[PDB]
């Protein structure tokens, strides 16, 4: 009905009026779509950030660092945030994006059975360096949006080389929205100590019928924006084309 001219339009549109530059790779089946109004971003390499926190659950989980509904307690420091000044599951850390809970589970799989997992996974450039705590944040791990669509697309149909129990446990923790009748699984990523900053949202859209459309929205993030911007060009974008 709607020409790819006009979806491609408004969908760049939804980047230049939010004052940022990005794209959003959709993947239908096994065929990837660019969209946003910096298509060049696809296949330039920036920091995973929270997005990491998905991987870091599977890891956690399936080498028993940590239980689905185990209570990791605040340790009572200031926080950053004052909704991570609480005793929370991964799954509420997941919502709440608490890297505190997602530091406390790095330190406990450790660097080395880090550093495994990631090569077996295969996840970005794959090097986590020396810092088992914060090498989603400020380096040296690195990933490209076509990457993170392609992570979302395993992890939403199970491929990834871990229990399809654990696969399980980590996609319940990421239902963020239901829109018309479909489901919206995905975290967010906001890279803060690197510069520019980085703003992610992966994950896919559950349609009623049952297909999967995975997605990564990715973008610059500048002082004082909003971080709800990514959920908005993310919803726009998936509603104009039809897939919400
Ligand atoms: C909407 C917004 O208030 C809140 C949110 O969500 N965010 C996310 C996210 O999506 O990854 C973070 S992560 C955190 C920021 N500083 C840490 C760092 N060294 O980069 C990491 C914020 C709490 C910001």
Same mark, same amino acid.
Do not use: C
């Given at each position: 009905?709607?020409?790819?001219?006009?979806?491609?339009?408004?969908?760049?549109?939804?980047?230049?009026?939010? &004052?940022?530059? +990005?794209?959003? =790779?959709?993947?239908?089946?096994?065929?990837? *779509?660019? #969209?946003?109004?910096?298509?060049?971003?696809?296949?330039?390499?920036?920091?995973?950030?929270?997005? @990491?926190?998905?991987?870091?659950?599977? =890891?956690?989980?399936?080498?028993?660092?940590?239980?689905?509904?185990?209570? @990791?307690?605040?340790?009572?420091?200031?926080?950053? #945030?004052?909704?991570?000044?609480?005793?929370?599951?991964? !799954?509420?850390?997941?919502?709440?994006?608490?890297?505190?809970? #997602?530091?406390?589970?790095?330190?406990?799989?450790?660097?080395?059975?880090? &550093?495994?997992?990631?090569?077996?996974?295969?996840? !970005?450039?794959?090097?986590?360096?020396?810092?088992?705590?914060?090498?989603?944040?400020?380096?040296?791990?690195?990933?490209?949006? %076509?990457?993170?669509?392609?992570?979302?697309?395993?992890?939403?149909?199970?491929?990834?080389?871990?229990?399809?129990?654990?696969?399980?446990? %980590?996609?319940?923790?990421? $239902?963020?929205?239901?829109?018309? +009748? *479909?489901? =919206? #699984?995905?975290?967010? +990523?906001?890279?803060? !100590? %690197?510069?520019? &900053? %980085?703003?992610? $949202?992966?994950?896919?859209?559950?349609?009623?019928?049952?297909?999967?459309?995975?997605?990564?929205?990715?973008?610059?993030?500048?002082?004082?924006? *909003?971080?709800? =911007?990514?959920?908005?060009?993310?919803?726009?974008?998936?509603?104009? $084309?039809?897939?919400?």
């Amino acid at each position: 009905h709607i020409s790819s001219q006009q979806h491609e339009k408004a969908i760049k549109s939804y980047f230049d009026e939010a &004052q940022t530059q +990005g794209v959003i =790779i959709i993947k239908e089946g096994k065929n990837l *779509s660019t #969209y946003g109004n910096a298509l060049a971003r696809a296949n330039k390499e920036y920091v995973p950030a929270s997005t @990491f926190d998905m991987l870091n659950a599977l =890891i956690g989980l399936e080498n028993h660092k940590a239980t689905t509904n185990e209570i @990791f307690k605040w340790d009572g420091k200031k926080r950053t #945030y004052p909704m991570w000044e609480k005793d929370m599951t991964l !799954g509420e850390a997941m919502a709440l994006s608490a890297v505190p809970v #997602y530091q406390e589970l790095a330190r406990r799989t450790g660097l080395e059975l880090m &550093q495994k997992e990631v090569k077996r996974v295969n996840f !970005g450039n794959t090097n986590i360096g020396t810092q088992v705590d914060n090498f989603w944040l400020v380096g040296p791990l690195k990933i490209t949006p %076509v990457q993170e669509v392609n992570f979302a697309d395993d992890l939403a149909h199970n491929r990834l080389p871990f229990k399809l129990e654990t696969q399980e446990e %980590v996609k319940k923790m990421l $239902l963020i929205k239901e829109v018309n +009748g *479909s489901k =919206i #699984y995905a975290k967010s +990523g906001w890279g803060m !100590g %690197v510069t520019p &900053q %980085v703003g992610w $949202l992966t994950g896919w859209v559950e349609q009623a019928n049952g297909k999967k459309i995975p997605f990564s929205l990715n973008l610059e993030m500048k002082e004082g924006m *909003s971080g709800s =911007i990514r959920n908005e060009i993310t919803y726009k974008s998936l509603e104009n $084309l039809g897939i919400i």
